[PDB]
Design a protein around this ligand. Sequence first.
Ligand SMILES: CC(C)[C@@](O)(C(=O)N1CCC(C2CCN(c3ccc(C(=O)N(C)C)c(Cl)c3)CC2)CC1)C(F)(F)F
Lengths: 259, 215
Amino acid sequence: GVQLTAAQELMIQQLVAAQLQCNKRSFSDQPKVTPWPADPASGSASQQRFAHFTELAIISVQEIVDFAKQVPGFLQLGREDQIALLKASTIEIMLLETARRYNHETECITFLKDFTYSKDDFHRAGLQVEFINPIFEFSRAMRRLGLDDAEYALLIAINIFSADRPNVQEPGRVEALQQPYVEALLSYTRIKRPQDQLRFPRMLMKLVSLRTLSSVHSEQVFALRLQDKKLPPLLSEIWDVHEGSGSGSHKILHRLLQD
Amino acid sequence: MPVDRILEAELAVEVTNICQAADKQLFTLVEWAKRIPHFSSLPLDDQVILLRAGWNELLIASFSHRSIDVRDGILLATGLHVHRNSAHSAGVGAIFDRVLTELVSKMRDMRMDKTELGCLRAIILFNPDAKGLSNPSEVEVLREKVYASLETYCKQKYPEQQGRFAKLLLRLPALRSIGLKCLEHLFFFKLIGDTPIDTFLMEMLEAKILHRLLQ
Ligand SMILES: CC(C)[C@@](O)(C(=O)N1CCC(C2CCN(c3ccc(C(=O)N(C)C)c(Cl)c3)CC2)CC1)C(F)(F)F
């Protein structure tokens, strides 16, 4: 009592395609990130490990924004609304992209093909264990579920169209854009595993888990401010960190969306 | 996981006032948890963990479903109702706007019954993510048992509404975020200390009565 229409199949296809072509621009930008570095007496190696992660996050933001521009309907919405959606979804989509790059055999996370990181390396880059353990506890929970590229792409699309985000002008338009992607996930999962009906509610529930992970990310940024760690404008604006850029006066996410 | 026993547990229930009504409902909450399938059969430490993890969301869900027939306000179990204009002067208006828009109006516009809400509250309750759980696998199976019963209830009770089950689950991410902002405001009341909070709600905020209530 389920069907994946030709229209839904072609929609899912564009999502996987968009995701892969964004990864292409993301892989080109690899020589831009400061290299991962015995630490000198100056203390610069720590600054280098922090900047590495910072620049990888910037690459990850640019990828999300280019993916949303390619998710049908998103560019129809008002600029205020699309900024409001990506601001809240960034960290959620960021953790989703971290989880699919988790290797259970090595217990490591691989970014941009070459950069492989363990729980220690995440700590060395300035992150706290209160954020590291949930990152790896979610990564290995995403693995148990064992998603494909179509499932990841649909879940990212559903996450973007969460009407409840702060400063969403037209919640009605956003809730309307979400439902076709939700029915496409229901159909795809039921056609993928005809025997396991629990696949789809298990996927939707991961969006609830992402909400806690955002809350845990906020605790990490609060800690970064104690540590006098300076986030670049783009990250400061998306996550409301520093006075100036945190006010959105810089209008980066806006300029990024414009072109 | 029978839906009728979930509905039976739901129907089983007959400013400073929000803090009063919350503390009152915490006792009621333990009586609802015992009634819902396979909960009492679960380890005593896990039942504490589960109730300590979701009490905020579980009550916000109950207050939202009660307020279905009242405009711009929340109907507390005490009998008194709190309006939007008082919430905005209390300095807790923005989050109050979020509860009515995302939870109350949605539950109203979709005519969410007490069986569906019971299933959602049971999904909220059986959280395998709760910190310190001895056996998180058995908590996951039970939560999955709810998905199965709710989807089956949904298709039978509401045919020609094939996206209803999802619409019910999609309130949960919003509820999680709302519960988090609801809990930070309660901590401000506890840190400021304008009007003292009752012992059970004080036990929930601080991290006794709960252990005594379990048997
Ligand atoms: C930015 C960073 C200093 C930090 O503020 C933070 O918020 N982090 C959470 C997100 C995490 C990112 C790391 C980079 N990222 C990806 C994820 C995937 C890829 C990838 O391979 N793509 C093809 C996109 C790439 Cl290039 C980057 C997602 C998780 C880094 C730590 C802090 F760690 F909390 F301090």
